[PDB]
């Protein structure tokens, strides 16, 4: 097993860049998704240069900050995606932040954007004026169709979370999604179980329910998008930012 930190372990694809000295995040630089403007939205990915050996454990701690933006014009969310496919395929097919994407792939999403035609968004009651979002494990089948899998393991069994707020006390010690916060993703290869922790909540699934297998090696993609595939343009800042310097990724490469 290795442990790595830093953006140089990833190859960037699509609508992604580096933001130097963000005045609102408290870090000296940050990787920034959803920059620019296109008529069918924005889509971007960072692909880990090594593949992950799924016969061995992994633990990821990813520091992410969500856009402080309406969920009808802001970013679609974060998708932490495992696939035999690659980032260039993701850029034209989608990942796990919508209704369809890269086939036979799966991972965990932090959903920050309301796609009013999507069944998963409707059942999660994402429509509203607040910063309404939700977390979930998602699997794409052999035709690429996305389905929620696993479940939330808090008492609520609910997926809902506020992905940003209007607090003037962001350093009070509590969760404020527009600042940098830990996404923890843990996998125990012996048992097949994958767990995600974010915003004080916890989810769990098996890699079997994600459509993945133990005796394989997968590409790992940190992905985001903004209104991608919806033919609605880009009409607000939807920056989604991750501090890869302060993140850590432990896994067995393959
Ligand atoms: Ca959504």
């Amino acid at each position: 097993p290795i442990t790595i930190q830093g953006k140089e372990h990833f190859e960037g694809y699509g609508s992604v860049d580096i933001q130097k000295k963000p005045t609102d995040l408290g870090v000296s630089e940050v990787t920034r998704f959803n920059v620019g403007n296109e008529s069918n939205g924005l889509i971007g990915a960072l692909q880990l240069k090594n593949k992950i050996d799924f016969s061995k454990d992994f633990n990821f701690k990813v520091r992410v900050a969500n856009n402080h933006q309406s969920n009808t014009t802001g970013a679609d969310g974060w998708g932490f995606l495992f696939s035999k496919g690659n980032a260039e395929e993701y850029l034209t097919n989608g990942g796990i932040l919508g209704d369809k994407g890269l086939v036979n792939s799966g991972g965990f999403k932090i959903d920050t954007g309301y796609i009013y035609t999507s069944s998963m968004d409707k059942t999660e009651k994402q429509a509203g004026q607040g910063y309404r979002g939700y977390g979930a494990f998602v699997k794409n089948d052999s035709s690429g169709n996305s389905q929620m899998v696993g479940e939330n393991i808090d008492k609520s069994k609910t997926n809902f979370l506020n992905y940003a707020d209007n607090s003037t006390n962001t350093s009070d010690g509590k969760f404020h999604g527009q600042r940098l916060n830990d996404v923890i993703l843990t996998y125990v290869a012996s048992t097949g179980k994958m767990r995600a922790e974010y915003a004080g909540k916890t989810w769990e699934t098996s890699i079997t329910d994600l459509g993945l297998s133990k005796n394989q090696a997968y590409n790992f993609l940190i992905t985001s998008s903004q209104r991608w595939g919806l033919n609605q343009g880009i009409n607000a800042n939807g920056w989604m930012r991750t501090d890869l310097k302060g993140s850590e990724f432990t896994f067995t490469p393959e």
Side-chain angles (χ1 to χ4, degrees), residues 1-10 12-17 19 22-48 50-55 57-58 60 62-83 85-99 101-124 126-128 130-138 140-146 148-154 156 159-173 175-192 194-213 217-247 249-253:
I2 73 187
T3 298
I4 55 175
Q5 311 185 266
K7 72 187 186 285
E8 290 77 15
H9 296 279
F10 300 82
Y13 295 81
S15 176
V16 63
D17 78 330
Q19 180 181 12
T23 40
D24 51 347
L25 296 183
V27 290
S28 55
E29 77 174 7
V30 78
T31 293
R32 170 169 54 181
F33 286 79
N34 305 321
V35 295
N37 188 326
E38 305 292 337
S39 70
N40 197 31
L42 303 169
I43 188 165
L46 265 54
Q47 178 163 338
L48 184 63
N50 302 334
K51 290 169 190 282
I52 316 292
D53 180 353
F54 261 47
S55 66
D57 296 348
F58 72 73
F60 295 167
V62 194
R63 311 267 295 159
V64 303
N66 307 319
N67 63 1
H68 184 260
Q69 186 55 251
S70 173
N71 74 1
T72 58
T73 59
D76 303 340
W78 300 98
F80 306 97
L81 182 60
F82 304 91
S83 180
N86 57 63
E88 287 202 63
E89 288 172 333
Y90 157 86
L91 290 186
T92 55
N93 284 271
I96 55 179
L97 286 167
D99 291 339
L102 206 51
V103 302
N104 303 300
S105 309
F108 184 71
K109 79 166 165 172
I110 304 169
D111 188 320
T112 65
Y114 176 45
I115 299 173
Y116 72 101
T117 51
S118 156
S119 307
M120 208 191 308
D121 285 5
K122 290 173 192 164
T123 65
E124 288 296 324
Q126 187 164 30
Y131 304 103
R132 299 184 60 71
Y134 62 99
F137 282 103
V138 178
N140 293 347
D141 64 20
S142 297
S143 294
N145 298 127
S146 312
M148 184 182 301
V149 296
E151 53 189 69
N152 179 258
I153 66 172
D154 306 300
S156 37
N159 301 306
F160 177 83
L161 61 92
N162 288 305
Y163 61 78
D165 68 25
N166 291 331
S167 177
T168 52
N169 295 287
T170 54
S171 285
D172 61 12
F175 172 84
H176 311 265
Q178 70 273 17
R179 296 271 293 192
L180 289 162
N181 295 101
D182 292 339
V183 187
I184 297 164
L185 197 71
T186 58
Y187 167 67
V188 179
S190 70
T191 70
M194 197 186 281
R195 182 181 289 253
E197 303 172 39
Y198 181 67
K201 294 177 64 56
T202 308
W203 297 258
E204 270 199 303
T205 191
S206 65
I207 64 164
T208 293
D209 301 310
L210 289 175
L212 309 173
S213 301
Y218 290 104
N219 296 322
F220 174 58
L221 287 76
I222 300 173
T223 68
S224 189
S225 53
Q226 181 179 7
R227 314 310 291 174
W228 181 78
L230 304 181
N231 195 42
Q232 289 171 352
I234 293 289
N235 303 115
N237 290 343
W239 298 344
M240 295 284 269
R241 295 175 288 174
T242 174
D243 170 17
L244 294 177
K245 183 177 299 177
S247 303
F249 304 80
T250 306
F251 65 99
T252 294

